[PDB]
Paper text:
Strikingly, unambiguous density located in the central cavity of [name].3 close to the fenestration between DI and DII was observed, which fits well with BLA. The receptor site is defined by M380, T381, V416, I419 and L420 from DI, and C941, G942, M968, N972 and L976 from DII. No direct interaction from DIII or DIV was observed for BLA binding in our structure. The functionally closed activation gate of the complex structure shows that the gate is too small for BLA to access the central cavity. Furthermore, the bulky BLA partially blocks the ion path, which would surely be an obstacle for conducting hydrated-Na+.
Voltage-gated sodium (NaV) channels generate rapid sodium influx to initiate and propagate action potentials in excitable cells. [name].3 is involved in numerous physiological processes including neuronal development, hormone secretion and pain perception. Here we report structures of human [name].3/β1/β2 in complex with clinically-used drug bulleyaconitine A and selective antagonist ICA121431.
Numbering used by the authors:
A (entry chain C): 27 to 148
B (entry chain B): 20 to 192
C (entry chain D): 116 to 209, 212 to 283, 313 to 438, 741 to 987, 1189 to 1778
The structure:
């Protein structure tokens, strides 16, 4: 194969203060199991600097409570239906950046990538 | 494949005998490590004293005088999966005529499930001095001869009856 | 005035050609799996051209603002729909819409040339007569599937589970590591509890707990899966696997089910379908036929060349040269050494030189282009030019494939060979007069290939790791067009379900079911129609006194029946020569002496025939010769055994000839004798056409040898049994350096020489064995080189072409000559209904009158009571249809049955069955109150009476079994009264009635041919028991389906009779030497050694049985088909 077809829009902007739904939904043939499924979320403000991780799914959901932005992230998806979008609270002007969803659903061998530009529109 | 046959019931004095114990695996392709205890009881004796032990390749025997240097192995050689447990008793005497037990212990290998199965084969032998031919062979031979003779008699009776009839039919002209 | 401009353009010839070429290039573009970005503009050009065409049609079939213009024709709807859906898809965010018009745009190809519409219409009107045949097919499929549903209910899910060495029973069943996988099968082994069923390995117990055997799809638990499995059985697609799984789960004693369906559903329903399609096509054909200096030098050289011999050695010498060239090409093999490869090369050079000399001698005498007029001259010129090009090149990579083109010179024999000329005529006729049908078939195959590709490409690519363990594409996928075409072609050849399982597991059960059944129906119907079209477009003082007594004794019926009985006894005495005879040890000696009895009695019988007939009149008879030879073999065996020459190789091999003892039944059984006579009468024409087939297959075998010649050699990782990759081992120098872990294994069915090529072509044309052959051929790179997965991916086309020619046109010629020979034979007989003796002919022509009868209204009125109105109400068609509705509802509520249903659900089903039973008994008692006088005008009332009695009895024993000593294996069998209760549908099922009556009328000839087939099976099963009872337990021969016992030999032979699994059953016997087997492997309790079968005797056994069974099945097919024709026409 080539990759995993992940249905994520190019960009989406939320009004300030209101709750934001960060989308990460994939369309995989394989019936996902909660023992081998791998997922992670990455946030970037650079162009060519090191990247840090803040949300993982490995046999269970893990929120590391990243100290940079906030504890705003929350699990609001459902892996069994191949939609693992997350919940974001208290959107602030410092939240603008690029967010990347990394997916690895056994027995597939392709790491699905989803890019989104987290901006704010009036 | 392999079949389980019953060992011959009687042996003959002075000659050799082959006691069989064929514990064929229920599934042929399953790998196994088979060893076996051979024991027996004398006629009129109520016990079971181990006489020998067969392992991967080597056969071990006790200090029993009834088989000291007069028994050899005739099972499967060089396989580690015996599936045949045969004792060849050379120079059969009146020492050994009783009830043999063949305790075949098979460690069957699998994916990650080693099974440890035990099967017991009991065979009764009774050494005699004259080789008595089996009753089935005698009855079959007698029946063969009787059938041949009676069918020849039937054939000649029909031939002579037809000869008389054809004579009566042909002397008319 | 306004539409006059767009009327001339419509009917203009170049506009039709424009539509032609745009459709053709659109079809070429759909071939691409992942087209580049620039093809989208080309698709825009295509749809613009289609819109331009539709605008022309709109401006031509409507005047003064007309809305619907081209709405009175079928294909115009297709064009409008595809254009609309092309413009509907313009909204990208509308998707599952690309796979909606692209599978519909492919249907535009049907209108590729004006004229295919007539062929499609003819096919549609021809499949219209199949209504009764298909309703009977679905009726029998449902009845047999209900039988399988009540017998094998959840049996296929039996799996050997290990005894718990410790969620309890909930996380133990669903572990899949606690079952038994058969050492590289990725599926738990099916098992059983009763005898003659699957034997659990020591430490395992058989439990009805698992998913299913094959991806969840081959099972009897639900009537839908039962219907699928029995459609599989009826089409004989890979049914040997279902055969083995079902007989391992339920037991070997259930094969009687298959013996019925394979004879009733798989054999007879196919015969009905073929007969009625032939009937429809005969009707269409009959309807169509009834409705329709320098000049001096030139002259002297012409005098020199033309004025030569004509008959003496100018056209016979050329034929001899062609035959010698064919023999030289066939002499090629591998590994061929020098001073023979050089000999073959110089022979080829001499032959091409002499052919050039002949061509120049002919052209300088015929002055082209007058030489290029007769067709054969053009063909000779083309082939000799190809030979010159190939000899001038001698290095053409990578298509030296044209080197085999010289084999076409063999077809120059067609000038003198009438049968080869007929085969060439048929081949040319298919591309000529039946060119329309050939193009329809090609277009339909292409359309199905592209539909499968568009529907399942991304699926087979992303879902792939569900059907493959390496998560890579399988051998047969629809990701790209070539593989999609290969799958569609394999579906036509017969193997649909093996890829339909993967299709279900990848891209939707319902979608793949619909796609594959549409393919299996349409493409197979098109192939059958093309085959039928090609088939039909081909045309003493004491001495004499004792002699009378002996003659009378021999001809006496007493002696005759005594001899028949004792022949049967002697034949059956052979079936006890199992591998268990040594454990029997008493019937062993009983049979040892019975053999002496039988041979003495047969010697006496032979001497009586002698002294009654005379040596001349005895050795004149072929049957007497056969009996005399068998008696001589038995006598030599007896003499050797008596003298002590028993433990010798020659005598032991001659003892195997004891399997010929059942042959004495040929002269005794009348139906068997007449069937053998009918076969021998047709054997001359069959032999001539088989020689034609041998020549054609020899051409194909030499081509295959040229292509492969030992490229099938590969390195198997000796520790696991799988092929090495080229990343580790690339060539023979490396598979001889790995050492002990590398074996350089062969395929054992390859194209190394012409004999092995014949074997491989036989496997390919029988369609059971072609799998590994094509795999190795496609993988092959070159001589002494490790194969690569689909390195020569396009060598699939070789075998495709073979199946097209040597398996299809060759089969057409064979069938045509059989029809012609049987037509002439039955016209000579007087004369009709061969394969029948005199008693069976009397039965047949009395049964004809019995079936051709009508009721003589013998139901006047009851006798003076309310039974008058009871009769007036019962006799009505409303009641006669209400009873059928109740029967249909009973059939439906049985279909509702499913494995592991609830206790409440089972109780509800029992109550519904009780209600149906009481209503049926009420109907019976109403008919009784009506016609107590007789009630027995026709046998249908008696059938209803007996079936209702049997249903009551079955219910009573079911209750008894539940209330007392219980056994499911008998409860399931005794719950089969429901089958007869629904078989009562034939009472009202007209058409089905006459088809079953045709079957019941053809039963006598079918029984005679079946008796001959059973005798052949008995002889070959005894041969198997003698030879292959100790071969290795490889692919086709396992612990249950082998040649150890008479039952196992007969189940294997019944499997082979339908040509199924003979490749697998031959694979372990082809092994000759280590490391494939062990020549001295002692196994108790038998004195025999070695687990390797002799390849020569194995090939002889299997090929001879395949040929004999093919002849017997063709005879059965023709008997049923001619019976149907005589009944209907
Ligand atoms: C009828 C129209 C046939 C058009 C064939 C075009 C082949 C498509 C193609 O190039 O696919 C590429 C190659 O495909 C092939 O090799 C085609 C093989 C030709 C044999 C199959 C022909 C199918 C229809 C004839 C039956 C793969 O990308
Ligand atoms: C003509 C063609 C008609 C095709 C109709 C297709 C209907 C498909 C509906 C369907 O999917 O139901 C399935 C029907 O089961 C089948 O296998 C369908 C068999 C249909 C055979 C038709 C043969 C004609 C049930 O799925 P499941 O058993 O619950 O899932 C098991 C997964 N391992
Ligand atoms: C024509 C053959 C019809 C056979 C119907 C068997 C359906 C199996 C079934 O109902 O099982 C149950 C499955 O339920 C269904 O049938 C729903 C599946 C719908 C898939 C599309 C069905 C297409 C129907 C033929 C077109 C369980
Ligand atoms: C239409 C039918 C066209 C021909 C059909 C089948 C031809 C079978 C040719 C078998 C060639 C066997 C090649 C071969 O090497 O087998 C060799 C032995 O060849 C044979 O004896 C097989 C001969 C087959 C004769 C078939 C007789 C048919 C009788 C019809 C009734 C030895 O093999 P090895 O492994 O090297 O030791
Ligand atoms: C008339 C032409 C076609 C009629 C087809 C009738 C056979 C279809 C039977 C469907 C059926 O009974 O549903 C079965 C389940 O039965 C049930 O208990 C569900 C409700 C049953 C209602 C039955 C309705 C009958 C309709 C008559 C028309 C299928 O079970 P499953 O899901 O496949 O279990 C497999 C577990 N992995
Ligand atoms: C006689 C065997 N043989 C020869 C023929 C005839 O040559 C002109 C050509 C080659 C083709 O393959 C080898 C055939 C078909 C492929 C198929 O898969 C196959 O399986 C091994 C068996 C067949 O059928 C049956 C009942 O033997 C179908 C069946 C199929 O496709 C089908 C079956 C039933 C059906 O309607 C209920 C629709 C389609 C046969 C013939 O046609 C009846 C046809 C089979
Ligand atoms: C074939 O015969 C064997 C021999 O008995 C059958 O094995 C039996 O299987 C049943 C269940 O299938 C066992 O019942 C028990 O069920 C409870 C749950 O209710 C569970 O906790 C137990 O561990 C066990 O599974 C039964 O014990 C078991 N028999 C023996 C002796 O262990 C088998 O079911 C038969 N299969 C068929 C298809 O006939
Ligand atoms: C009307 C004519 O009646 C017959 C006359 C002889 C004829 C034409 C016919 C049948 C066999 C034919 C032969 C089969 C042989 O097979 C071949 C071909 C293959 C060779 C390996 C062996 O011989 C032909 C040379 C041989 C043959 C084609 C030559 C011609 C023979 C028809
Ligand atoms: C090392 C390998 O040894 C090989 C050497 C060549 C040899 C003997 C072998 C196989 C094919 C053999 C050929 C099959 C051909 O079949 C025949 C015979 C039948 C013909 C219908 C066709 O050609 C032989 C002329 C042809 C053949 C018998 C001639 C000899 C060939 C074994
Ligand atoms: C011992 C009990 O275990 C089973 C072993 C196999 C056995 C004997 C069983 C019954 C049916 C038997 C079959 C009837 C079939 O009839 C035949 C013969 C005639 C064929 C026209 C059709 O099938 C056999 C292949 C088939 C058969 C004779 C082969 C052997 C089968 C019992
Ligand atoms: C057979 O294959 C081997 C390797 O599988 C060839 O040996 C060398 O392989 C390396 C691969 O890393 C190549 O780079 C070399 O060019 C190969 N050697 C030569 C001389 O070309 C080997 O050549 C192949 N052929 C034979 C006859 O052994
Ligand atoms: C039994 O063992 C003897 C050795 O004492 C050997 O000669 C003989 O061949 C063996 N018999 C069998 C059947 O193995
Ligand atoms: C058996 O052993 C006895 C011991 O004395 C000996 O006399 C006899 O000859 C032996 N017989 C055979 C056959 O070895
Ligand atoms: C038989 O048994 C007796 C008593 O155990 C022993 O003394 C004798 O030596 C045995 N026979 C032979 C031949 O050894
Ligand atoms: C179990 O296997 C061991 C060897 O690992 C063996 O010693 C023991 O006898 C076996 N158990 C029984 C009951 O035989
Ligand atoms: C054969 O396969 C096994 C496991 O798949 C592997 O360990 C071994 O190395 C292979 N053999 C060779 C010669 O590489």
């Amino acid at each position: 194969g080539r990759s995993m077809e992940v249905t994520v829009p190019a960009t989406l902007n939320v009004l300030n203060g209101s709750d934001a739904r960060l989308p990460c939904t994939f369309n995989s043939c394989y019936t996902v199991n909660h023992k081998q499924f791998s997922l992670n979320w990455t946030y970037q403000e650079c162009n060519n600097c090191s990247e840090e991780m803040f949300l993982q799914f490995r046999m269970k959901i893990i929120n590391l409570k990243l100290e940079r932005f906030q504890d705003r992230v929350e699990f609001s998806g459902n892996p069994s239906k191949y939609d693992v979008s997350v919940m974001l609270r208290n959107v602030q002007p410092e939240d603008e950046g690029i967010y990347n969803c990394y997916i690895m659903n056994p027995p597939d061998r392709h790491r699905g990538h989803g890019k989104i530009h987290l901006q704010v529109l009036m | 494949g392999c079949v389980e046959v019953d060992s011959e019931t009687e042996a003959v004095y002075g000659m050799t005998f082959k006691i069989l114990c064929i514990s064929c695996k229920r599934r042929s392709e399953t790998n196994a490590e088979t060893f076996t205890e051979w024991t027996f009881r004398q006629k009129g004796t109520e016990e079971f004293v181990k006489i020998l032990r067969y392992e991967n390749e080597v056969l071990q025997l006790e200090e029993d005088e009834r088989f000291e240097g007069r028994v050899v192995w005739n099972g499967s050689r060089g396989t580690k999966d015996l599936q045949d447990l045969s004792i060849f008793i050379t120079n059969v005497t009146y020492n050994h005529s009783g009830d043999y037990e063949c305790h075949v212990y098979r460690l069957l290998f699998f994916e990650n499930y080693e099974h440890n199965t035990s099967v017991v084969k009991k065979i009764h032998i009774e050494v005699v001095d004259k080789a008595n031919r089996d009753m089935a062979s005698i009855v079959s031979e007698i029946m063969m001869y009787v059938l041949i003779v009676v069918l020849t008699i039937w054939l000649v009776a029909e031939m002579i009856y037809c000869y008389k009839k054809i004579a009566a039919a042909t002397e008319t002209a | 005035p306004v539409r006059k401009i767009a009327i001339k353009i419509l009917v203009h010839s170049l506009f039709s050609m424009l539509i032609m070429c745009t459709i053709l290039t659109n079809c070429v573009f759909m071939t691409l799996s992942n087209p580049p970005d620039w093809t989208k503009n080309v698709e825009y050009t295509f749809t613009g051209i289609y819109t331009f065409e539709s605008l022309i049609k709109i401006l031509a079939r409507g005047f003064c603002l007309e809305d619907f213009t081209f709405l009175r024709d079928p294909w115009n709807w297709l064009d409008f729909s595809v254009i609309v859906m092309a413009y509907v898809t313009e909204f990208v965010s509308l998707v599952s819409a690309l796979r909606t018009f692209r599978v519909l745009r492919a249907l535009k190809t049907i209108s590729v040339i004006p004229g295919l519409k007539t062929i499609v219409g003819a096919l549609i009107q021809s499949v219209k007569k199949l209504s009764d045949v298909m309703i009977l097919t679905v009726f029998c499929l449902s009845v047999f599937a209900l039988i399988g549903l009540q017998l094998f209910m959840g049996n296929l899910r039996n799996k050997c589970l290990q005894w718990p060495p410790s969620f309890n029973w909930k996380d133990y069943i669903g572990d899949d590591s606690h079952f038994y996988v058969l050492d590289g099968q990725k599926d738990p082994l099916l098992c059983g509890n009763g005898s003659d069923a699957g034997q659990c390995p020591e430490g395992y117990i058989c439990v009805k707990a698992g998913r299913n055997p094959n991806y969840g799809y081959t099972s009897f638990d639900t009537f839908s899966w039962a219907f699928l499995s029995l459609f599989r059985l009826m089409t004989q697609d890979y049914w040997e696997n279902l055969y083995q799984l079902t007989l391992r789960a339920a037991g070997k004693t259930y094969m009687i089910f298959f013996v019925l369906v394979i004879f009733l559903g798989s054999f007879y329903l196919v015969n009905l379908i073929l007969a009625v399609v032939a009937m429809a096509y005969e009707e269409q054909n009959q309807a169509t036929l009834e409705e329709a200096d320098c000049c001096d030098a030139w002259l002297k050289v012409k005098h020199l060349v033309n004025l030569i011999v004509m008959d003496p050695f100018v056209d016979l010498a050329i034929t001899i040269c062609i035959v010698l060239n064919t023999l030289f090409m066939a002499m090629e093999h591998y590994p061929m050494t020098e001073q023979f490869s050089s000999v073959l090369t110089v022979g080829n050079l001499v032959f091409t030189g002499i052919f050039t000399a002949e061509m120049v001698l002919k052209i300088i005498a015929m002055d082209p282009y007058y030489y290029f007029q007769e067709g054969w001259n053009i063909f000779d010129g083309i082939i000799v030019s190809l030979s010159l090009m190939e000899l001038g090149l001698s290095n053409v990579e990578g298509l030296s494939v044209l080197r085999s083109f010289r084999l076409l010179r063999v077809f120059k024999l067609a000038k003198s060979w009438p049968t080869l000329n007929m085969l060439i005529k048929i081949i040319g006729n298919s591309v000529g007069a039946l060119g329309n049908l050939t193009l329809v078939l090609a277009i339909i195959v292409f359309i199905f290939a592209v539909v499968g590709m568009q529907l399942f490409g991304k699926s087979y690519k992303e879902c792939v790791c569900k059907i493959n363990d390496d998560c890579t594409l399988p051998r047969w996928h629809m990701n790209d067009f070539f593989h999609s075409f290969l799958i569609v072609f394999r579906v036509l050849c017969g193997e649909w379900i093996e890829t339909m399982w993967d299709c279900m597991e990848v891209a939707g059960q319902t979608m793949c079911l619909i796609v594959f059944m549409l393919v299996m129906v349409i493409g197979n119907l098109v192939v059958l129609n093309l085959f039928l079209a090609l088939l039909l477009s081909s045309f003493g003082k004491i001495w004499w006194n004792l002699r009378k007594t002996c003659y009378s004794i021999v001809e006496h019926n007493w002696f005759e029946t005594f001899i028949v009985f004792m022949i049967l006894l002697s034949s059956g005495a052979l079936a006890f020569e199992d591998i268990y005879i040594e454990q029997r040890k008493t019937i062993k000696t009983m049979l040892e002496y019975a053999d002496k009895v039988f041979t003495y009695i047969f010697i006496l019988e032979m001497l009586l025939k002698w002294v009654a007939y005379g040596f001349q009149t005895y050795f004149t008879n072929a049957w007497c010769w056969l009996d005399f030879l068998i008696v001589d073999v038995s006598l030599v065996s007896l003499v050797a055994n008596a003298l002590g020459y028993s433990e010798l190789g020659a005598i032991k091999s001659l003892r195997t000839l004891r399997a010929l003892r059942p042959l004495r039944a040929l002269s005794r059984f009348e139906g068997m004798r007449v069937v053998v006579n009918a076969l021998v009468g047709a054997i001359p024409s069959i032999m001539n056409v088989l020689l034609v087939c041998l020549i054609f297959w020899l051409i194909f075998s030499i081509m295959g040898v040229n292509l492969f010649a030992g490229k099938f050699y590969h390195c198997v990782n000796m520790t696991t049994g799988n092929m090495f990759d080229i990343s580790d081992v690339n060539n023979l120098s490396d598979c001889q350096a790995l050492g002990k872990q590398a074996r350089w294994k062969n395929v054992k069915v390859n194209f190394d020489n012409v004999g092995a090529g014949y074997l491989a072509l036989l496997q390919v044309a029988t369609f059971k064995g072609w799998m590994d052959i094509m795999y190795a051929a496609v993988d092959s790179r070159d001589v002494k080189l490790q194969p690569v997965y689909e390195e020569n991916l396009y060598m699939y086309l070789y075998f495709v072409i073979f199946i097209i020619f040597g398996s299809f046109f060759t089969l057409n010629l064979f069938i045509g000559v059989i029809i012609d020979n049987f037509n002439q034979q039955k016209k000579k007989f007087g004369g009709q209904d061969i394969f029948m003796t005199e008693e069976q002919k009397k039965y047949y022509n009395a049964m004809k009158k019995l079936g051709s009868k009508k009721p003589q209204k013998p139901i006047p009125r009851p006798a003076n009571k309310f039974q008058g109105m009871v009769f007036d109400f019962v006799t009505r068609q409303v009641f006669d249809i209400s009873i059928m509705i109740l029967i249909c509802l009973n059939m439906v509520t049985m279909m509702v049955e499913t494995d592991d249903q609830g206790k409440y659900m089972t109780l509800v089903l029992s109550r519904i069955n009780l209600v149906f039973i009481v209503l049926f008994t009420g109907e019976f008692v109403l008919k009784l109150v009506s016609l107590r006088h007789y009630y027995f005008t026709i046998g249908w009332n008696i059938f209803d009476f007996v079936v209702v009695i049997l249903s009551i009895v079955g219910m009573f024993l079911a209750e008894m079994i539940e209330k007392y000593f219980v056994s499911p294996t008998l409860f399931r069998v005794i719950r089969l009264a429901r089958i007869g209760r629904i078989l009562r549908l034939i009472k009202g099922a007209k058409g089905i009635r006459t088809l079953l009556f045709a079957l019941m009328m053809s039963l006598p000839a079918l029984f005679n041919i079946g008796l001959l087939l059973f005798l052949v099976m008995f002889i070959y099963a005894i041969f198997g028991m003698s030879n292959f009872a100790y071969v290795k337990k490889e692919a086709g021969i396992d612990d249950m389906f082998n040649f150890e016992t008479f039952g196992n030999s007969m189940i294997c032979l019944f499997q082979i009779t339908t040509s199924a699994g003979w490749d697998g059953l031959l694979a372990p016997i082809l092994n000759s030497a280590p490391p494939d087997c062990d020549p001295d492997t002692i196994h108790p309790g038998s004195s025999v050694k070695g687990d390797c079968g002799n390849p020569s005797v194995g090939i002889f056994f299997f090929v001879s049985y395949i040929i004999i069974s093919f002849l017997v099945v063709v005879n059965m097919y023709i008997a049923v088909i001619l019976e149907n024709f005589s009944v209907a026409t």
